[PDB]
Amino acid sequence: DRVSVGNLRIARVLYDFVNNEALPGTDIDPDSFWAGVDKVVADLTPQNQALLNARDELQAQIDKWHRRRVIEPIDMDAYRQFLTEIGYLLPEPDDFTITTSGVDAEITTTAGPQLVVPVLNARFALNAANARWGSLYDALYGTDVIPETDGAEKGPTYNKVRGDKVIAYARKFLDDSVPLSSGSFGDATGFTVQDGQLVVALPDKSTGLANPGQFAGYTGAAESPTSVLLINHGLHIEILIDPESQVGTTDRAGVKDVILESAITTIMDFEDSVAAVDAADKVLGYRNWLGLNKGDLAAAVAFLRVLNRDRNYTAPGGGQFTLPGRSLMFVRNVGHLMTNDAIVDTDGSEVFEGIMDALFTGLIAIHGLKASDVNGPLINSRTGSIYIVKPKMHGPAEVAFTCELFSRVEDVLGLPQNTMKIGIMDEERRTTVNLKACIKAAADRVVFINTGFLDRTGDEIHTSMEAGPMVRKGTMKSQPWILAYEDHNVDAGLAAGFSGRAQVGKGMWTMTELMADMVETKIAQPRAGASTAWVPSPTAATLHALHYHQVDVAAVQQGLAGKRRATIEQLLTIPLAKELAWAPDEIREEVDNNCQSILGYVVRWVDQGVGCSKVPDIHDVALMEDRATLRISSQLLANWLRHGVITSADVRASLERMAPLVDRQNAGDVAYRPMAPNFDDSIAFLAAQELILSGAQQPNGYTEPILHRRRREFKARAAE
Ligand SMILES: [Mg+2]
């Protein structure tokens, strides 16, 4: 336990991992590496600390600003000049264009779904990386896109009618995406390859594609292919053919399945979807990350799950070519705020988890750039670039600091400059109002921006905590600030020249069980100009790819350039309740909803160390809860409590009223301790109660300190 290197005390469980598993193959001298680590942690920590204090300073000045201006309607011009003078608002920089080179085509060119997965879960990570290709049949059958109404529902045995509905859906999709010259795919009787072009055998005629350029390849014999590979809007569509199969004999063409290129890119998350409070957890995360970059990562289930090898097809000509079988992987480090053990000072204080993440993740990602016996067969980046998305950055200063950190890390690892690219999240109000500046700060490392509306909502609440009673969270979608936020985001991205160089991304779909609703509504994002959008599951990625097959994102971006449909005054518009009063029924509805949402997530975060749970709301609708939604739910209550809408008695009564209901949900597990009826002695209950009753004092409303504290406290009160 504990190993002293330089002025650092490094936990043994980390030192062993880094020196025995990560370092070998990176051609980096362990002594030189650790020395560089000590030097970086020494040089950048004070500059790092100044930023976190600036957050508390700025927030304090604004908090006081609301106190001495009560009841009266807020004067927006005074607000603007105030944020201007205090530094919260920065001048709009001179127009420019990024020059981030050495980026893979999956980011610069290809537009499609993007996955986000907790890296601590091997299975979900493997499925995420393998979600590059996903069955449309399984996605249509398994989900509610095809209703179980009049016709046929689901059951233990395969359903014929539902299967035919799925097939019909897929056929219509094929007709709409890669259309035939005349007729429909629903009438196809077979597929052949004659003279370098695709020939579809209809009962009436025989035909090719309306534009044969959409024919990308095939497998097997030319006159009897096992699969036909097509392409639309950069996304590949694969039609599996096996007339004498499980689904082939039923189909009138022998089509077994329709595989779609789904998750183009995948985010390996070390933040809001995971629970890592100590050294061992970080070691697990880094372990799975290492397995991902090496390619030897596996997970058993009566068989074993591994990463997909690259796919190989026959070109229309006759030669064999190869498409990527895995998703291009980003990795999301933690924010600047939180610290961690693992390595500590000579004194005894924790070290910024962000720096650690930069160094370690950066080090590990080197394996995924090369293909050998030491580094592992599977190669992540073909262009030789490390893609790291940095979340929760407050402004151009912090962005620039992340750039400096990345530069230093690249110096340590011996990587050429700008090897480690950055995915600037847009989920901070200051970052939102200084977006162009944040982009300019990383105008040679930026690979994407992204609307993280959840943390942006939470930050929006906490920033104007003292301004007055906010509205119910379910109303936040109708507020001007968030729409202006999205539009300004896309506009800034396109103005920066992201079209063909970088990605403009949009937030997550949380209703995991409402896939029909997702198909219906999520098409708004690619129609809004979003080069990419976040999906909760591989299936959801498969279903979300449809939108990109229907919407020409590139053309939308071309038709969106120059337009400025977002004013700064709309961005600073606080989502106050104005002069609206809710009925006690609505009040207690919102309170109980929030409390259930809090409990259901914090109980699994604290006890079982799960950073992302499928928790239902109060209307019995399964949502996907992580730190962001928890943050919104906590800050909302911390607002209503701090403005006399509700009291501590109300929130306690609601928590005690919703605690047994949450127990009902998790009463099927094995390692689940019922937090009832002894509410006072449950660490999870205390965690929730503190998250609510002290959320107003949390730095930028962040939920990391409390969660980590209670998680450590749980691990301690169970070790014996
Ligand atoms: Mg976030």
Author numbering: 3 to 303, 309 to 727
Paper text:
GlcB generates malate and coenzyme A (CoA) from glyoxylate and acetyl coenzyme A (AcCoA) following the conversion of isocitrate to succinate and glyoxylate by ICL. Because of the essentiality of the glyoxylate shunt in infection and the absence of it in humans, both ICL and GlcB are attractive targets for drug discovery. The active site is an ∼20 Å-long tunnel located at the interface of the TIM barrel and a loop comprising residues 616–633 of domain II.
We repeated the experiment following the method of Smith et al., crystallizing GlcB after incubation with substrates and capturing the products formed in the active site. Crystals produced after preincubating GlcB with substrates glyoxylate and AcCoA for 30, 40, 50, and 60 min prior to crystallization were examined for product. Crystals from 30-, 40-, and 50-min preincubations gave ambiguous electron densities with only partial electron densities for CoA and the Asp-462 side chain present. The enzyme crystallized after longer preincubation with the substrates (60 min) resulting in a refined model of the GlcB-malate complex. The active site loop is closed as malate still maintains a weak hydrogen bond with the backbone nitrogen of Leu-461 (3.0 Å) but is too far to hydrogen bond with the Phe-460 backbone (3.5 Å). Moreover, we observed the later stages of the catalytic cycle in the malate-bound structure after CoA dissociation, and we obtained the complete GlcB apo structure in crystals from the longest incubation with an excess of substrates in the reaction mixture.
